[PDB]
Design a protein around this motif. Structure first.
Motif, PDB file in Angstrom:
ATOM      1  N   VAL A 267       8.344   2.117 -11.510  1.00 52.98           N
ATOM      2  CA  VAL A 267       8.119   3.587 -11.671  1.00 52.98           C
ATOM      3  C   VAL A 267       6.671   3.831 -11.277  1.00 52.98           C
ATOM      4  CG1 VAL A 267       8.244   5.618 -13.246  1.00 52.98           C
ATOM      5  CG2 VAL A 267       9.639   3.592 -13.770  1.00 52.98           C
ATOM      6  N   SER A 268       6.471   4.400 -10.088  1.00 55.66           N
ATOM      7  CA  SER A 268       5.123   4.679  -9.630  1.00 55.66           C
ATOM      8  C   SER A 268       4.525   5.671 -10.573  1.00 55.66           C
ATOM      9  CB  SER A 268       5.074   5.272  -8.210  1.00 55.66           C
ATOM     10  OG  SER A 268       3.730   5.624  -7.821  1.00 55.66           O
ATOM     11  N   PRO A 269       3.311   5.385 -10.991  1.00 54.29           N
ATOM     12  CA  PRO A 269       2.585   6.261 -11.913  1.00 54.29           C
ATOM     13  C   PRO A 269       2.330   7.609 -11.257  1.00 54.29           C
ATOM     14  CG  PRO A 269       1.624   4.055 -11.754  1.00 54.29           C
ATOM     15  CD  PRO A 269       2.522   4.208 -10.591  1.00 54.29           C
ATOM     16  N   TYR A 270       2.689   7.760  -9.979  1.00 54.88           N
ATOM     17  CA  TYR A 270       2.486   9.018  -9.260  1.00 54.88           C
ATOM     18  C   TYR A 270       3.811   9.617  -8.692  1.00 54.88           C
ATOM     19  CZ  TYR A 270      -2.198   6.913  -9.736  1.00 54.88           C
ATOM     20  OH  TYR A 270      -3.313   6.286 -10.251  1.00 54.88           O
ATOM     21  N   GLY A 271       4.934   9.115  -9.203  1.00 57.55           N
ATOM     22  CA  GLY A 271       6.230   9.592  -8.754  1.00 57.55           C
ATOM     23  C   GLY A 271       6.692  10.886  -9.400  1.00 57.55           C
TER      24      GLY A 271
ATOM     25  N   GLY B 131      -6.744   5.424  -8.052  1.00 60.57           N
ATOM     26  CA  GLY B 131      -6.150   4.543  -9.035  1.00 60.57           C
ATOM     27  C   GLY B 131      -6.478   5.129 -10.431  1.00 60.57           C
TER      28      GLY B 131
ATOM     29  N   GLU C 226      -4.905   9.542  -7.230  1.00 58.60           N
ATOM     30  CA  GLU C 226      -4.115   8.440  -6.750  1.00 58.60           C
ATOM     31  C   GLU C 226      -4.902   7.574  -5.819  1.00 58.60           C
ATOM     32  OE1 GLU C 226      -0.598   9.345  -4.482  1.00 58.60           O
ATOM     33  OE2 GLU C 226       0.053   7.402  -5.328  1.00 58.60           O
TER      34      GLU C 226
ATOM     35  N   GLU D  92       9.019  11.608 -11.610  1.00 59.48           N
ATOM     36  CA  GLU D  92       9.162  11.476 -13.050  1.00 59.48           C
ATOM     37  C   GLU D  92       7.863  11.703 -13.792  1.00 59.48           C
ATOM     38  OE1 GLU D  92      10.068   8.698 -10.961  1.00 59.48           O
ATOM     39  OE2 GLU D  92      12.173   9.483 -10.819  1.00 59.48           O
ATOM     40  N   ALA D  93       6.829  10.942 -13.435  1.00 58.77           N
ATOM     41  CA  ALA D  93       5.530  11.034 -14.084  1.00 58.77           C
ATOM     42  C   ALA D  93       4.927  12.385 -13.868  1.00 58.77           C
ATOM     43  CB  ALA D  93       4.598   9.971 -13.559  1.00 58.77           C
ATOM     44  N   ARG D  94       5.107  12.922 -12.674  1.00 58.58           N
ATOM     45  CA  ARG D  94       4.564  14.234 -12.383  1.00 58.58           C
ATOM     46  C   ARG D  94       5.379  15.253 -13.158  1.00 58.58           C
ATOM     47  NH1 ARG D  94       2.282  12.692  -7.078  1.00 58.58           N
ATOM     48  NH2 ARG D  94       2.187  14.905  -6.382  1.00 58.58           N
TER      49      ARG D  94
ATOM     50  N   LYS E 258      -3.567  13.791  -5.670  1.00 56.04           N
ATOM     51  CA  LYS E 258      -3.760  12.890  -4.533  1.00 56.04           C
ATOM     52  C   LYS E 258      -5.065  12.142  -4.618  1.00 56.04           C
ATOM     53  CE  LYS E 258      -3.543  13.130   0.014  1.00 56.04           C
ATOM     54  NZ  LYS E 258      -3.698  13.885   1.347  1.00 56.04           N
TER      55      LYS E 258
END
Length: 283
Positions: free
Chosen positions: A1-5, A277, A274, A7-9, A271
């Motif tokens: 699960v990308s911390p920037y996907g 990091g 991201e 879901e997280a967003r 962005k």
């Protein structure tokens, strides 16, 4: 699960919306500054100013701090507010004024946006002169014109404030991550040079954390202003590990719940976070 996907967003939005709704001003809301006796205080009745961080009792303007970054965010002053505006500008020993309202908005007389930094003028006890100096391409066709505002008033020491006007950034839009990083740098460096000048002069304002703060405003002071502020916050190394969630909650809690207005402006901040990091969510 990308911390920037998605879901997280999806979660970040969930949280920020709840917050925005909670901060909505109520009638004579005690959390927000109220207009005294008739003169209009607010440019848009629903874009209010936190009493707690109010810079002046008669201006829609707030002292903001995200992490370790100190700035002032405000609305475009109304005609009746201009003398107090310059007063705030001067006492703050403003290292840099960043205006993000477009020339078209300023030009349009129905918007009541006095062209205060590109012409000379008198305003009560204060007189002002402007002087254009440089023009810088930020990228994407976006251009920053710079001016030097000399604020004089009898019995007061004369103050110069350097101005950076992004004349073509449209309201409700988000400039790219790159133009945004480029403008933040341009504002930091301008602030730096002026600060250093005060410092080499032994200004006492140099000690005071309520002074020497960059002043930023678009029209309302919550969209274009908030995007740039989140960017300055990100290119200050001392704000290491501050998340996008904190960044936005501190802006909303210190001015109003609208700070970082459009969804696309939040995407630019995400962005950059991201690219660094930097975490989106707390915990």
């Amino acid at each position: 699960v990308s911390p920037y996907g998605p879901e997280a967003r999806a979660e970040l939005s969930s949280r920020l919306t709840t917050l925005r709704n909670t901060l909505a001003p109520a009638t004579n809301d005690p959390r927000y500054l109220q207009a005294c006796g008739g003169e209009k205080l607010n440019r848009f009745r629903d874009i209010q100013c936190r009493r707690q961080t109010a810079v002046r009792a008669d201006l829609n303007a707030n002292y903001i701090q995200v992490g370790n970054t100190r700035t002032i965010a405000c609305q475009y002053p109304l005609q009746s507010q201009l003398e107090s505006h310059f007063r705030m500008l001067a006492e703050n020993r403003t290292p840099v004024l960043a205006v993000l309202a477009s020339s078209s908005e300023i030009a349009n007389q129905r918007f009541g946006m006095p062209d205060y930094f590109r012409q000379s003028g008198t305003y009560g006890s204060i007189t002002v002169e402007s002087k254009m100096t440089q023009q810088v391409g930020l990228g994407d066709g976006i251009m920053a014109d710079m001016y030097t505002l000399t604020i004089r008033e009898a019995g007061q020491k004369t103050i110069s404030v350097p101005v950076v006007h992004v004349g073509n950034w449209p309201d409700q839009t988000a400039v790219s991550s790159e133009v945004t990083k480029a403008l933040a740098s341009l504002v930091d460096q301008t602030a730096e040079t002026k600060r250093n000048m005060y410092e080499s002069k032994g200004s006492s304002a140099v000690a005071d954390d309520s002074k020497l703060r960059p002043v930023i405003h678009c029209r309302a002071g919550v969209g274009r202003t908030a995007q740039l502020i989140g960017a300055m916050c990100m290119n200050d190394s001392r704000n290491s590990q501050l998340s996008v969630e904190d960044m936005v909650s501190q802006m909303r809690v210190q001015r109003n719940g609208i700070m970082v207005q459009k969804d696309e402006q939040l995407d630019v901040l995400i962005k950059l976070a991201e690219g660094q990091g930097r975490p989106l969510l707390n915990s």
